[PDB]
Amino acid sequence: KQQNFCVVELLPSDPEYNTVASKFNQTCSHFRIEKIERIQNPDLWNSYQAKKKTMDAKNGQTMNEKQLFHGTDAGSVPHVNRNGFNRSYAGAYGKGTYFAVNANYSANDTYSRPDANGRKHVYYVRVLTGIYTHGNHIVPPSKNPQNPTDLYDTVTDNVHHPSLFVAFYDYQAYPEYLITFRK
Ligand SMILES: NC(=O)c1cccc(NC(=O)/C=C/C(=O)O)c1
């Protein structure tokens, strides 16, 4: 299972396109979008769905999935397209992977670092946030001290008004779209 992938450009025409643009535009309408691409990685996608199938049947009425933003340098884009956000990724709440509710956070040059042509990249990612608590600065805390292998799926900065989520597990996030844009 080598998780090869294709990149398909999203046509302005595509219903999909407008949904990503709108959500991006809530907090980043001052940036100019060059393009939006869909990342098609069947092995990565299947393994993502496997964890979701598990997580749904486990968390009852909880909506496990959210769509969050993650900014990264150009160099990491191939890495992320193949391996999502699993383990071997160089790009005070955790040692997992951070994801932003609002594009503007991710659009910081420190995450969405401009390349030579001045182009910034932010993914719009399906993340399985599941059941979360407030996090502190490598594995999530345990839900129940009397049953402590049962863990929070993610942690967040504020539980009832969250602006970021941290994932620590494998196949917990799928990089469905990439948004390329400039200042
Ligand atoms: N990659 C992002 O878009 C993003 C979004 C929200 C938060 C962060 N990262 C952090 O706040 C801290 C990352 C780290 O300490 O490695 C990145």
Tab-separated table of C-alpha atoms and ligand atoms in Angstrom:
chain	number	residue	atom	x	y	z
A	1	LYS	CA	0.000	0.000	0.000
A	2	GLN	CA	2.260	2.805	-1.343
A	3	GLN	CA	-0.362	5.566	-1.380
A	4	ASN	CA	0.334	7.033	-4.787
A	5	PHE	CA	-1.811	9.952	-5.783
A	6	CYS	CA	-3.101	12.222	-8.529
A	7	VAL	CA	-3.682	15.940	-8.422
A	8	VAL	CA	-6.746	17.227	-10.299
A	9	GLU	CA	-7.273	20.977	-10.785
A	10	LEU	CA	-10.727	22.107	-9.576
A	11	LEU	CA	-12.667	23.911	-12.313
A	12	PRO	CA	-14.253	27.280	-11.291
A	13	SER	CA	-17.385	25.738	-12.782
A	14	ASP	CA	-17.380	22.923	-10.196
A	15	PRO	CA	-19.891	23.291	-7.370
A	16	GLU	CA	-17.154	21.998	-5.040
A	17	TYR	CA	-14.902	24.965	-5.960
A	18	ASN	CA	-17.289	27.552	-4.608
A	19	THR	CA	-17.617	25.807	-1.259
A	20	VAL	CA	-13.839	25.876	-0.645
A	21	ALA	CA	-13.573	29.473	-1.878
A	22	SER	CA	-16.373	30.676	0.428
A	23	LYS	CA	-14.923	29.074	3.495
A	24	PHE	CA	-11.467	30.447	2.580
A	25	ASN	CA	-13.024	33.852	1.969
A	26	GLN	CA	-14.586	34.182	5.419
A	27	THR	CA	-11.243	35.346	6.784
A	28	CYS	CA	-8.927	35.552	3.707
A	29	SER	CA	-10.716	37.589	1.023
A	30	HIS	CA	-7.704	39.980	0.805
A	31	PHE	CA	-5.574	37.216	-0.797
A	32	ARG	CA	-5.885	36.324	-4.524
A	33	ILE	CA	-6.681	32.654	-5.260
A	34	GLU	CA	-4.702	31.143	-8.165
A	35	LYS	CA	-6.218	27.672	-8.027
A	36	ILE	CA	-7.763	24.916	-5.982
A	37	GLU	CA	-6.770	21.288	-6.547
A	38	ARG	CA	-8.283	18.008	-5.395
A	39	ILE	CA	-5.874	15.357	-4.067
A	40	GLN	CA	-6.898	11.797	-5.023
A	41	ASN	CA	-5.081	9.186	-2.936
A	42	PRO	CA	-7.181	5.956	-2.681
A	43	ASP	CA	-5.020	4.130	-0.101
A	44	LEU	CA	-4.776	7.225	2.135
A	45	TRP	CA	-8.476	7.884	1.619
A	46	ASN	CA	-9.465	4.306	2.450
A	47	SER	CA	-7.366	4.258	5.558
A	48	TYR	CA	-8.977	7.605	6.532
A	49	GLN	CA	-12.499	6.179	5.993
A	50	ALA	CA	-11.513	3.105	8.087
A	51	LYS	CA	-10.719	5.277	11.085
A	52	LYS	CA	-13.978	7.220	10.496
A	53	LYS	CA	-16.120	4.058	10.314
A	54	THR	CA	-14.479	3.039	13.629
A	55	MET	CA	-14.905	6.506	15.153
A	56	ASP	CA	-18.566	6.888	14.141
A	57	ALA	CA	-19.623	3.586	15.742
A	58	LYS	CA	-17.662	4.656	18.873
A	59	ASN	CA	-18.813	8.276	19.513
A	60	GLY	CA	-22.573	7.816	19.108
A	61	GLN	CA	-24.177	11.096	18.064
A	62	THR	CA	-20.947	13.057	17.694
A	63	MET	CA	-20.105	14.460	14.282
A	64	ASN	CA	-16.517	13.214	14.181
A	65	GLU	CA	-15.505	15.134	11.054
A	66	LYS	CA	-14.703	18.765	10.472
A	67	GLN	CA	-13.066	20.595	7.598
A	68	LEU	CA	-10.095	22.627	8.792
A	69	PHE	CA	-7.163	24.505	7.266
A	70	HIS	CA	-3.462	23.716	7.313
A	71	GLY	CA	-0.720	25.836	5.798
A	72	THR	CA	2.620	24.439	4.681
A	73	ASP	CA	5.642	25.273	2.537
A	74	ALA	CA	5.869	24.231	-1.135
A	75	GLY	CA	8.416	21.540	-0.268
A	76	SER	CA	5.999	19.679	1.973
A	77	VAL	CA	3.215	19.568	-0.616
A	78	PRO	CA	4.338	16.327	-2.257
A	79	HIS	CA	5.021	14.759	1.128
A	80	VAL	CA	1.522	15.674	2.317
A	81	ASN	CA	-0.136	14.496	-0.899
A	82	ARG	CA	1.348	11.011	-0.398
A	83	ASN	CA	1.403	10.539	3.397
A	84	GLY	CA	-1.226	13.003	4.652
A	85	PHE	CA	-0.090	14.308	8.037
A	86	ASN	CA	1.188	11.024	9.411
A	87	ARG	CA	4.326	10.696	11.586
A	88	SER	CA	7.360	11.857	9.532
A	89	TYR	CA	6.352	15.538	8.991
A	90	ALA	CA	8.686	18.524	9.726
A	91	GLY	CA	6.150	21.245	8.756
A	92	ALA	CA	1.833	24.789	23.477
A	93	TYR	CA	-0.997	22.302	22.875
A	94	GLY	CA	0.628	19.133	21.442
A	95	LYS	CA	3.149	17.150	19.398
A	96	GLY	CA	0.551	16.326	16.775
A	97	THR	CA	-0.581	18.292	13.776
A	98	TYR	CA	-2.376	21.600	14.147
A	99	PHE	CA	-5.417	22.525	12.083
A	100	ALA	CA	-7.211	25.861	11.943
A	101	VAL	CA	-10.946	26.525	11.874
A	102	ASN	CA	-10.244	29.765	9.951
A	103	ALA	CA	-8.100	30.063	6.833
A	104	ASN	CA	-6.509	33.332	8.089
A	105	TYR	CA	-4.593	31.549	10.745
A	106	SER	CA	-3.025	29.163	8.230
A	107	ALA	CA	-2.400	32.043	5.800
A	108	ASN	CA	0.363	33.305	8.076
A	109	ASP	CA	3.688	33.289	6.175
A	110	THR	CA	5.149	31.123	8.941
A	111	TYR	CA	2.916	28.223	7.872
A	112	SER	CA	1.880	29.061	4.302
A	113	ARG	CA	5.405	30.183	3.395
A	114	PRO	CA	5.564	31.959	0.061
A	115	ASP	CA	7.600	30.180	-2.635
A	116	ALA	CA	9.872	31.910	-5.233
A	117	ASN	CA	6.844	33.005	-7.292
A	118	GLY	CA	5.222	34.314	-4.101
A	119	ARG	CA	2.655	31.522	-3.918
A	120	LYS	CA	1.218	30.283	-0.612
A	121	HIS	CA	-0.400	26.888	-0.012
A	122	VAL	CA	-3.133	25.964	2.450
A	123	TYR	CA	-4.918	22.633	2.485
A	124	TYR	CA	-8.588	22.308	3.322
A	125	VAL	CA	-8.568	19.026	5.174
A	126	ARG	CA	-11.117	16.533	6.493
A	127	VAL	CA	-9.962	16.052	10.096
A	128	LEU	CA	-11.565	13.513	12.485
A	129	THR	CA	-11.781	15.690	15.545
A	130	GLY	CA	-14.145	13.311	17.395
A	131	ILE	CA	-14.345	13.971	21.118
A	132	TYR	CA	-11.985	16.664	22.321
A	133	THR	CA	-10.973	18.480	25.476
A	134	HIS	CA	-8.820	21.498	26.168
A	135	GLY	CA	-5.168	20.723	25.437
A	136	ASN	CA	-1.830	21.693	26.990
A	137	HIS	CA	1.735	21.625	25.624
A	138	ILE	CA	2.512	13.837	22.435
A	139	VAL	CA	-0.529	11.636	23.007
A	140	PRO	CA	-3.940	13.127	23.921
A	141	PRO	CA	-5.022	12.982	27.559
A	142	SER	CA	-7.214	10.084	28.702
A	143	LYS	CA	-10.984	10.535	28.888
A	144	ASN	CA	-11.579	8.401	31.986
A	145	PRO	CA	-8.917	7.849	34.721
A	146	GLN	CA	-10.798	4.612	35.614
A	147	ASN	CA	-10.499	3.474	31.944
A	148	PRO	CA	-7.402	5.474	30.844
A	149	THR	CA	-6.557	3.846	27.480
A	150	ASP	CA	-9.682	5.557	26.105
A	151	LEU	CA	-8.357	8.842	24.777
A	152	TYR	CA	-9.668	12.099	23.440
A	153	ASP	CA	-9.536	11.921	19.653
A	154	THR	CA	-8.154	15.498	19.463
A	155	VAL	CA	-7.494	18.477	21.713
A	156	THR	CA	-8.415	22.128	21.246
A	157	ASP	CA	-7.657	25.647	22.477
A	158	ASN	CA	-11.248	26.309	23.654
A	159	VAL	CA	-13.838	23.525	23.805
A	160	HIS	CA	-17.054	25.488	23.219
A	161	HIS	CA	-15.520	28.125	20.903
A	162	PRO	CA	-12.529	26.363	19.234
A	163	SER	CA	-10.237	27.972	16.687
A	164	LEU	CA	-7.702	25.129	16.323
A	165	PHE	CA	-7.504	21.341	16.753
A	166	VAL	CA	-4.560	19.004	17.323
A	167	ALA	CA	-4.526	15.460	15.890
A	168	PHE	CA	-1.985	12.876	17.151
A	169	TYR	CA	-2.941	9.691	15.307
A	170	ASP	CA	-2.394	8.196	11.927
A	171	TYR	CA	-4.900	8.470	9.103
A	172	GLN	CA	-6.828	11.032	11.156
A	173	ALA	CA	-6.764	13.683	8.460
A	174	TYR	CA	-7.209	13.700	4.652
A	175	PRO	CA	-5.872	16.642	2.540
A	176	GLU	CA	-8.794	16.829	0.196
A	177	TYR	CA	-8.099	20.233	-1.361
A	178	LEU	CA	-5.084	22.414	-1.821
A	179	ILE	CA	-5.588	26.139	-2.276
A	180	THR	CA	-2.808	28.013	-4.018
A	181	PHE	CA	-2.880	31.791	-3.662
A	182	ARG	CA	-0.820	34.990	-3.414
A	183	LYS	CA	-0.919	38.371	-1.639
B	1	LIG	N1	-0.252	24.768	9.709
B	1	LIG	C1	-1.179	25.656	10.046
B	1	LIG	O1	-1.895	26.239	9.235
B	1	LIG	C2	-1.341	25.864	11.394
B	1	LIG	C3	-2.577	26.254	11.903
B	1	LIG	C4	-2.727	26.461	13.272
B	1	LIG	C5	-1.646	26.292	14.136
B	1	LIG	C6	-0.397	25.927	13.617
B	1	LIG	N2	0.684	25.658	14.333
B	1	LIG	C7	0.887	26.096	15.586
B	1	LIG	O2	0.201	26.927	16.187
B	1	LIG	C8	2.155	25.493	16.222
B	1	LIG	C9	3.012	24.471	15.437
B	1	LIG	C10	4.263	23.861	16.046
B	1	LIG	O3	4.635	24.194	17.201
B	1	LIG	O4	4.913	23.026	15.373
B	1	LIG	C11	-0.267	25.688	12.252
